[PDB]
């Protein structure tokens, strides 16, 4: 039944409208703002123990 709600999911127009320690971790993780790639960009890796920090590969 497309128009009718089957199970607990109903779609109208283009919108789908459904029925429904870790929880501290999900909500905190839900609040994360910057991406992983953005986190990597600021970080440079010391190739050599005493060498310069290389940030971006050419």
């Amino acid at each position: 039944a497309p128009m009718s709600d089957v199970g607990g999911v109903l779609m109208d127009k283009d919108a789908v409208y459904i029925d429904i320690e870790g929880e501290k971790l999900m909500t905190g993780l839900q609040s994360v703002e910057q991406s992983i790639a953005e986190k990597f960009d600021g970080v440079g890796l010391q190739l050599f123990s005493n060498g310069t920090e290389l940030h971006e590969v050419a």
Binding site: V16, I18, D19, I36, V43, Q46
Partner: protein, 842 residues
């Protein structure tokens, strides 16, 4: 009623419209209840999608049984949506071990129940079965698995670590998922977790070029039979082009021509070959040969030949007849097809070994050439048209540069064809690309111009450096580029490489990584990469911990193998290390980089050069120098390789001694495995000598049993390598004993001696010394003859071969490129020396 985040419906709809697959990772105990809803969003998106669902689990399903009859009975002793789904939809349940069964079938979905047990092969094996617009779900329900994710998000550096497996593959996966644009990480409440890369997904506008380039081609060739009918069967532009190229070779009629078809699995090679075979039939080619490791694999090829026959108007039982095998082993596989249209034309299967039959061959099709030994395929390359198909990263397949190594061997006119587009889904599907980064499957070695400008580094200047595994696999952009480079060097050098090894090098603790870097003066480019695994008493503690877990991890092959052959308890105690793999770039092969590295490797564990763990709930240097880390105390160095003259030549020059040779040749290579040892200075060495003599005595007797295929020169080499082992021993304790007169009497009767003298006098015929040659070869190569009797390499090879490998003399003439008469002449010269030697004893 809760509204779903617009990201989830948008991405799924986008993938369906673009026929691109997507990834969802659901975290939560109730995650299973979300799986029903997610699928319904597909079927709403498109009804043409495949409905079959793949379910993979390790041992147990999550709270339900796949037996309907039980499920009713369990209910007996209104439904939730979850069981409604398990009822109506077609779900195929899979144990992680039995991933081979799933390689052929297609599924709208794959569900990965257990994240911790995920493996590279299993992950690669499941996803490619998913169709364009399909979805991949990974169920991250374990509480610990949740813990790692949370640590990863707060900081990308600090690694959560529980109380020996580092399991490093599991988190690089996590970070890689964050990179994927079509991956979404979600909870059991459908909240989009921002760790995903699919953060700014927007719904694409409502609605491919390849189909246009494929469609247009078909009408243009429609009138050109037999091409039009055959090209119609093609599914992709590349597939059509490959078929056209095959037709071009068929038209050229040049019998010195070879066509190489290279593609990944599922790209439709067999269809291209099967169609091309049908093309040769209509063209007029009479004798068709097809060869493969087994005829069972050729079922798809033969099926697609007949569909081409259907396209060409050929009809079964009038134009052509099909013959199937009578042997139970091939399971009634099709062996021969006899065609009667306009003349007698024959398609027949042959075993790769029976190359003698190909003298009359006008074309042979070699399917899955990666699986046949290199000696066999070169014999199969005769004066006729050759079609060759080799899989890259499909089934076991072979290393990429082996496919190349065949190419430089071809460098006989050769034509190269590559099929890149898949026939199952849209090109450039993100998951396959995202797979490709993670497993580094398509990494390609790149010639470095900077090497040429400053020249190839002389080996002495190159210095070996230890590599920190934690920092490699941190998924840092610099670290990854090093991973691809070393992995590029990995996959190239050695014969075969499975996808699981990536997990092995990373997580297993005993494995250590060494790389021969160029002298320092940009990301350094490895010249040689060395991976060592510590086996001995050091590994016992880990093994006992595995025993405590109940799940014995890995195996000490060599403490085991040596134990079985010689039953020496000391070796099991002796700590040591084994070089799993020496990788040197083939183009810089023969410059001695590898020999330099092992020499430095030899020195490092000898102590001549005498915490970096990531934080456990900023990263250490990528590579560490030999001095900076203390070596473990080692007694010996061991190696694994199949007996090849180049490798065995490589090893012997580096002072290793053989200890065992496998009688049974490995089926996949056709090669016999070797274990070859070397004792480090300052550590006891007598036990090596005891085995090397035994292996020598073992090897000499086993020359004919299974090694008779080996060349005499190759045989002579390994005894020489074994003989070097006693030279290592300056001690005079263990020694050969010269033959006593009594022993000579027992082995040969007086009548035996008299006839031998006749030969030294030329009075008696060769065949009448059939029997005594083997013992004589046993006696001489046992060194029983002593200093008195000596021979050059060729004579030793001749005597070894007749006596111990047991050929006729004429066979030796061809191997040594010596005409038969002289081979008799040198042999008689050999005979006279010992006919003399026995006399002085008398």
């Amino acid at each position: 009623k809760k509204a779903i985040d617009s990201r989830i419906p948008s991405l799924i709809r986008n993938g369906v419209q673009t026929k691109q697959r997507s990834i969802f990772v659901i975290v939560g105990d109730r995650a299973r209840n979300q799986l029903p809803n997610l699928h319904y969003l597909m079927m709403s998106a498109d009804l043409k999608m495949n409905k079959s669902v793949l379910w993979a689990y390790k041992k147990k399903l999550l709270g339900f049984t796949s037996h309907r009859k039980k499920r009713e009975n369990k209910i007996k002793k209104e439904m939730d949506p979850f069981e409604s789904f398990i009822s109506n939809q077609n779900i195929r349940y899979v144990y992680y071990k039995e991933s081979e069964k799933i390689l052929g079938n297609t599924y709208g979905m794959c569900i990965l129940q257990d994240f911790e047990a995920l493996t590279p092969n299993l992950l690669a094996r499941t996803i490619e079965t998913v169709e364009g617009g399909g979805i991949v779900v990974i169920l991250l329900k374990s509480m610990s698995s949740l813990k790692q994710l949370y640590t990863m998000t707060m900081d990308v550096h600090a690694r959560y670590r529980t109380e020996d497996v580092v399991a490093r593959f599991n988190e690089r996966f996590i970070l890689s998922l964050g990179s994927n644009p079509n991956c979404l990480v979600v909870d059991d409440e459908l909240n989009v977790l921002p760790l995903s890369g699919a953060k700014n997904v927007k719904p694409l506008p409502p609605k491919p070029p390849k189909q246009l380039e494929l469609q247009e081609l078909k009408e243009s060739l429609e009138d050109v039979q037999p091409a039009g009918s055959l090209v119609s069967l093609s599914k992709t532009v590349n597939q059509a082009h490959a078929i056209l190229s095959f037709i071009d070779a068929i038209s050229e009629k040049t019998l010195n021509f070879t066509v190489a078809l290279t593609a990944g699995r599922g790209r439709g090679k067999s269809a291209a070959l099967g169609i091309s075979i049908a093309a040769a039939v209509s063209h007029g080619y009479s004798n068709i040969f097809v060869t493969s490791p087994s005829p069972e694999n050729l079922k798809t090829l033969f099926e697609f030949i007949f569909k081409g026959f259907d396209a060409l108007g050929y009809q079964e039982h009038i134009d052509y007849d099909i013959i199937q095998s009578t042997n139970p082993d091939f399971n009634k596989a099709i062996v021969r097809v006899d065609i009667k249209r306009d003349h007698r034309q024959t398609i027949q299967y042959i075993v790769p070994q029976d190359h003698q039959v190909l003298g009359q061959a006008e074309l042979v099709v070699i399917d899955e050439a990666a699986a046949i030994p290199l000696p066999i395929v070169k014999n199969l390359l005769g004066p006729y048209l050759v079609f060759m198909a080799s899989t890259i990263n499909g089934y076991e397949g072979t290393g990429r540069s082996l496919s190349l190594k065949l190419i430089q061997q071809l460098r006989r006119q050769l034509r190269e064809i590559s099929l890149d587009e898949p026939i199952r889904y849209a090109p450039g599907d993100p998951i396959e690309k995202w797979l490709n980064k993670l497993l580094c499957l398509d990494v390609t070695l790149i010639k470095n111009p900077r090497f040429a400008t400053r020249g190839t580094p002389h080996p002495s200047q190159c210095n070996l450096f230890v590599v920190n595994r934690d920092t490699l696999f941190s998924y840092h952009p610099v670290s990854e580029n090093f991973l691809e480079k070393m992995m590029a060097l990995y996959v190239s050098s050695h014969y075969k490489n499975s996808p699981n090894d990536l997990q092995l090098m990373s997580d297993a603790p005993a494995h250590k990584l060494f790389v021969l870097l160029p002298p320092i003066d940009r990301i350094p480019d490895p010249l040689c990469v060395i991976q060592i695994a510590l086996e001995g008493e050091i590994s016992k503690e880990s093994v006992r911990n595995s025993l405590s877990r109940g799940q014995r991890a890995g195996g000490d092959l060599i403490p085991w193998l040596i134990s079985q052959q010689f039953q020496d308890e000391e070796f099991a105690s002796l700590s040591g290390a084994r070089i799993v793999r020496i990788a040197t770039n083939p183009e810089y092969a023969s410059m001695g980089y590898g020999s330099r590295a092992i020499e430095l490797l030899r020195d490092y564990f000898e102590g001549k050069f005498t915490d970096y763990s990531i934080k456990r709930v900023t990263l250490p240097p990528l590579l560490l120098k030999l001095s900076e880390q203390p070596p473990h105390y080692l007694h010996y160095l061991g190696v694994s390789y199949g007996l090849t003259q180049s490798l065995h030549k490589f090893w012997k020059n580096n002072s290793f001694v053989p200890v065992y040779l496998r009688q049974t040749a490995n089926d996949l290579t056709g090669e016999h495995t070797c274990v070859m040892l070397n004792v480090l200075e300052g550590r006891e060495s007598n036990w090596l000598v005891e085995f090397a003599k035994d292996f020598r005595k073992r090897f000499l007797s086993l020359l004919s049993y299974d090694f008779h295929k080996f060349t005499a020169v190759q045989a002579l080499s390994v005894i020489e390598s074994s003989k070097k082992a006693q030279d290592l021993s300056d001690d005079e304790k263990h020694d050969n004993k010269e033959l006593t007169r009594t022993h000579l009497d027992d082995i040969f009767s007086p009548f035996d001696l008299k006839r031998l003298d006749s030969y030294s006098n030329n009075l008696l015929d060769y065949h009448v010394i059939g029997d005594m040659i083997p013992m004589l070869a046993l006696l001489y190569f046992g060194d029983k003859m002593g200093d008195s009797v000596k021979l050059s390499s060729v004579q030793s090879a001749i005597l070894l071969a007749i006596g111990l490998q047991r050929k006729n003399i004429d066979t030796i003439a061809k191997e040594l490129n010596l005409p038969s008469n002289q081979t008799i002449a040198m042999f008689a010269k050999i005979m006279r020396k010992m006919s003399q030697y026995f006399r002085q004893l008398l």
